[PDB]
Amino acid sequence: AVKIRLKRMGSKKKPFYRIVVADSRFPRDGRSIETIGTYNPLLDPVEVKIDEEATLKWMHNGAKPSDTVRNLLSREGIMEKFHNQKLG
Amino acid sequence: PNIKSAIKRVKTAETRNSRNASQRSAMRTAIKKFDEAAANNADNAKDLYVEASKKLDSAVSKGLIHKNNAARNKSRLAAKLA
Amino acid sequence: MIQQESRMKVADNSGAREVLTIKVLGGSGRKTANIGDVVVCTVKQATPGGVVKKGEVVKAVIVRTKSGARRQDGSYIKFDENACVIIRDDKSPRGTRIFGPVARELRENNFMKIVSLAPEVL
Amino acid sequence: RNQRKVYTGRVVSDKMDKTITVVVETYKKHGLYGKRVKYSKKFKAHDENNIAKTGDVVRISETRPLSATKHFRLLEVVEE
RNA sequence: AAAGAGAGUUUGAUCCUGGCUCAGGACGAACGCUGGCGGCGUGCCUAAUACAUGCAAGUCGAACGAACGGAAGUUAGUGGCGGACGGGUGAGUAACACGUGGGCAACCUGCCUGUAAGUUGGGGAUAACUCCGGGAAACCGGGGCUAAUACCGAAUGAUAGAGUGUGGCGCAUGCCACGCUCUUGAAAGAUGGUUUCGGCUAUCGCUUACAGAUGGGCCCGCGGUGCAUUAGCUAGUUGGUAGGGUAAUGGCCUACCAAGGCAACGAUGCAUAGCCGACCUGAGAGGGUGAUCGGCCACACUGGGACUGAGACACGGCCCAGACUCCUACGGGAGGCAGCAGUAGGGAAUCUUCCGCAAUGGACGAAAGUCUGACGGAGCAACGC
RNA sequence: CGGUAUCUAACCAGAAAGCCACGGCUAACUACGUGCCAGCAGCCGCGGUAAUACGUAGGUGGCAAGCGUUGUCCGGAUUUAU
RNA sequence: UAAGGAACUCGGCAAAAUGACCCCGUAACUUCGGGAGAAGGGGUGCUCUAUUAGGGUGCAAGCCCGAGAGAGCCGCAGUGA
Ligand SMILES: [Mg+2]
Ligand SMILES: [Mg+2]
Ligand SMILES: [Mg+2]
Ligand SMILES: [Mg+2]
Ligand SMILES: [Mg+2]
Ligand SMILES: [Mg+2]
Ligand SMILES: [Mg+2]
Ligand SMILES: [Mg+2]
Ligand SMILES: [Mg+2]
Ligand SMILES: [Mg+2]
Ligand SMILES: [Mg+2]
Ligand SMILES: [Mg+2]
Ligand SMILES: [Mg+2]
Ligand SMILES: [Mg+2]
Ligand SMILES: [Mg+2]
Ligand SMILES: [Mg+2]
Ligand SMILES: [Mg+2]
Ligand SMILES: [Mg+2]
Ligand SMILES: [Mg+2]
Ligand SMILES: [Mg+2]
Ligand SMILES: [Mg+2]
Ligand SMILES: [Mg+2]
Ligand SMILES: [Mg+2]
Ligand SMILES: [Mg+2]
Ligand SMILES: [Mg+2]
Ligand SMILES: [Mg+2]
Ligand SMILES: [Mg+2]
Ligand SMILES: [Mg+2]
Ligand SMILES: [Mg+2]
Ligand SMILES: [Mg+2]
Ligand SMILES: [Mg+2]
Ligand SMILES: [Mg+2]
Ligand SMILES: [Mg+2]
Ligand SMILES: [Mg+2]
Ligand SMILES: [Mg+2]
Ligand SMILES: [Mg+2]
Ligand SMILES: [Mg+2]
Ligand SMILES: [Mg+2]
Ligand SMILES: [Mg+2]
Ligand SMILES: [Mg+2]
Ligand SMILES: [Mg+2]
Ligand SMILES: [Mg+2]
Ligand SMILES: [Mg+2]
Ligand SMILES: [Mg+2]
Ligand SMILES: [Mg+2]
Ligand SMILES: [Mg+2]
Ligand SMILES: [Mg+2]
Ligand SMILES: [Mg+2]
Ligand SMILES: [Mg+2]
Ligand SMILES: [Mg+2]
Ligand SMILES: [Mg+2]
Ligand SMILES: [Mg+2]
Ligand SMILES: [Mg+2]
Ligand SMILES: [Mg+2]
Ligand SMILES: [Mg+2]
Ligand SMILES: [Mg+2]
Ligand SMILES: [Mg+2]
Ligand SMILES: [Mg+2]
Ligand SMILES: [Mg+2]
Ligand SMILES: [Mg+2]
Ligand SMILES: [Mg+2]
Ligand SMILES: [Mg+2]
Ligand SMILES: [Mg+2]
Ligand SMILES: [Mg+2]
Ligand SMILES: [Mg+2]
Ligand SMILES: [Mg+2]
Ligand SMILES: [Mg+2]
Ligand SMILES: [Mg+2]
Ligand SMILES: [Mg+2]
Ligand SMILES: [Mg+2]
Ligand SMILES: [Mg+2]
Ligand SMILES: [Mg+2]
Ligand SMILES: [Mg+2]
Ligand SMILES: [Mg+2]
Ligand SMILES: [Mg+2]
Q: Which is an annotated Pfam family here (chain D) (predicted)?
């Protein structure tokens, strides 16, 4: 089951996450299908950059955001679009 | 075994082995008594194709044979019917 | 019934494979040894890389024979080949494992370690 | 429709049934000096009706494996 | 754009040819003398040698029969899913193993997403439990009783099979769409709202079919090593005909028929070696390497085999054989650190038997939640920047 | 992780410098001891009672929490030369 | 003739052992012919398919020759002396 999740990279006690699409089976920092965006939690206003087009393409093919990703996509505001394109 | 979840697997697989071997050899007997009937051109050759067909695709629903395997064998037996 | 020039297989873990008997200990004109009897012998065939080499003079104990022993209760035992175990100055074997069945008569001769190591004491 | 690969060579042997041996000649420059060199490796093609004869110039197309070694089929007989 | 340094040494003295040596850079390095700190990384290259002792794979009572509680509320076994992922090692392998580019009209795919049909009616058991019997122990038999989303028939339902009609087609074998006749193939309930109780209904499920996505299987062109003081190699070998088997083509296997196939453009044999992205050096072209990080492969004490499953011929699963260690009441039994630490040995040479699931990602669950030596951190060593 | 990183308040020049070379290649030289001995060395080669080459001092030169030696690879090597 | 198997003896003298047909395979050395039946192994009986597949003979009737296979059956043993 392919799902979108964070990927930890950076230095010791300085994490930086890169939103990727990959299977659950593959390692956390291993194979991935493609990359969507990044996520910096250290910045006090957390800044995130997303494709907003590859995500919606993937979520109509059987992709599920994880716990932290869903908060990111909701705050950015594309799960509304996933709502509207589903029923419309 | 020495992981508690592994002791169950070794003994629950034997129960599946027992049930599978029993009805897998039931399938082969129906085929065994068809091709010999086809050679003799008896009247039983026609209706021995039906339960052999019934045995083959019942095994698919039971899940111990692939649907391509069942579909293939039925076609090849039908040729021998003459 | 094993006398001089008799040639018997060795049934332990030392380097030897086959043995020819030189002398039957235990008397002046003695001419035969049987199960449980120590015999002086020489190595005619050895496995490569073993402890005991070819052409070496050693003593050993007979452990099973084609003409076995009779018991006080009137019963007999007979094997299919003549086998041997190479021992030290005392009654301790020079190998670490023993192959095949072993006659019970070795216990009464106080060959306790060999009986302990044997896979079957018949 | 995706298209398979087609080659062109010269028949060498027809002593086998239903098949021919075709040598394909090709160029390839040397790795370090840079001089073009002949390179020929022969294939196996399926002769449906033994049409092709020794020495002919033919065209062969790629297919699924027809046998242990054959995975090409004869297409045209350009020259005899 | 970039763009290349020489020196010493044969002679009584010289100019050429020519070898040897030196000045530079880099290590997973070691040794010698010395030694303050912080940040970021690295640390068995040898014996794929043998392994004490702890922990690394479980979860679900919202699928089915118990103990505390005056019978409210929380905790073993059957059953489902997961253990094929994550983690380790480089032995073997000179070949479609890998890199790069294609083909599959010759293939499969649990969980995930969408859509369409339904989820109707029965039967016989068996664990647990309770007695008896055997053995030192591992553990094995016999009698009786019970349930389930456990198991087995039944009604209805195929683009599954056979026989056809049409069209539109393609790359030879052949493909796509629709229609007709005949024969086979399915299922499970649980937790709640309403009503009345009939019944309806929400959620998670269950069966069949088709799409997408994902992960794999097979075939092919080209590319990357030493020896000719290694010249022939092969017989299921090479092709064909019929059948068997597989998810799928194929000598993959079998019977028959013929004698073919490969090689001086280096077959065969011996020796060595996991492959690549990349790393070091170099003006460049090249030369040497493949530790750490990422992708693929092979292996799991040494050989062989298969079962269960969507997926294995399976690191902490099973059976047989072998070597080794251990427990035996002599009848028989139990094991596998190339998982994280740690021990002995080898070596010139390499670390703690530590703290947590708080973050990320995994398995189970409807969810809190449980498991996670993955992973986050900490400890030792001027090993490097 | 962890009262960790990070601030501000005060006292102390106080606890904190070694390693290798100095004939040429190659930056850096004088005394004393020894007398083909002890010894040095990558090459040329130094030592046989005035040694800038052996051993120790003073001084100097390269680096510095380092500095030297050994092993392996590329360069210089146009010394396999497309 | 049990167990042993040259311990006998000047010396394996004498005796024992191998022995037919078909198939596989075969070394040093060589004067290139050999060595060579080197060595070392495997199969043999009877019944059915079977007047076989196919050959010799004849104008036909018929007669003679007889490989491969499959399935079986019986003994301690199938060139059973
Ligand atoms: Mg914040
Ligand atoms: Mg049915
Ligand atoms: Mg001179
Ligand atoms: Mg020169
Ligand atoms: Mg340089
Ligand atoms: Mg240097
Ligand atoms: Mg210190
Ligand atoms: Mg120190
Ligand atoms: Mg290692
Ligand atoms: Mg090993
Ligand atoms: Mg243990
Ligand atoms: Mg734990
Ligand atoms: Mg309950
Ligand atoms: Mg549930
Ligand atoms: Mg329980
Ligand atoms: Mg793995
Ligand atoms: Mg390897
Ligand atoms: Mg590796
Ligand atoms: Mg590829
Ligand atoms: Mg019942
Ligand atoms: Mg019972
Ligand atoms: Mg019962
Ligand atoms: Mg139906
Ligand atoms: Mg039905
Ligand atoms: Mg389903
Ligand atoms: Mg994979
Ligand atoms: Mg294939
Ligand atoms: Mg190749
Ligand atoms: Mg075929
Ligand atoms: Mg083959
Ligand atoms: Mg080769
Ligand atoms: Mg250069
Ligand atoms: Mg380069
Ligand atoms: Mg390592
Ligand atoms: Mg080991
Ligand atoms: Mg299966
Ligand atoms: Mg295995
Ligand atoms: Mg496993
Ligand atoms: Mg494997
Ligand atoms: Mg694994
Ligand atoms: Mg283990
Ligand atoms: Mg064992
Ligand atoms: Mg370890
Ligand atoms: Mg050690
Ligand atoms: Mg040591
Ligand atoms: Mg966690
Ligand atoms: Mg989590
Ligand atoms: Mg779920
Ligand atoms: Mg645990
Ligand atoms: Mg822990
Ligand atoms: Mg870690
Ligand atoms: Mg440090
Ligand atoms: Mg040091
Ligand atoms: Mg404080
Ligand atoms: Mg401050
Ligand atoms: Mg002050
Ligand atoms: Mg100078
Ligand atoms: Mg002086
Ligand atoms: Mg000097
Ligand atoms: Mg000096
Ligand atoms: Mg000084
Ligand atoms: Mg100084
Ligand atoms: Mg520094
Ligand atoms: Mg250094
Ligand atoms: Mg060096
Ligand atoms: Mg060069
Ligand atoms: Mg006799
Ligand atoms: Mg006898
Ligand atoms: Mg003999
Ligand atoms: Mg003799
Ligand atoms: Mg005598
Ligand atoms: Mg004499
Ligand atoms: Mg004679
Ligand atoms: Mg005939
Ligand atoms: Mg005879």
A: Ribosomal_S17
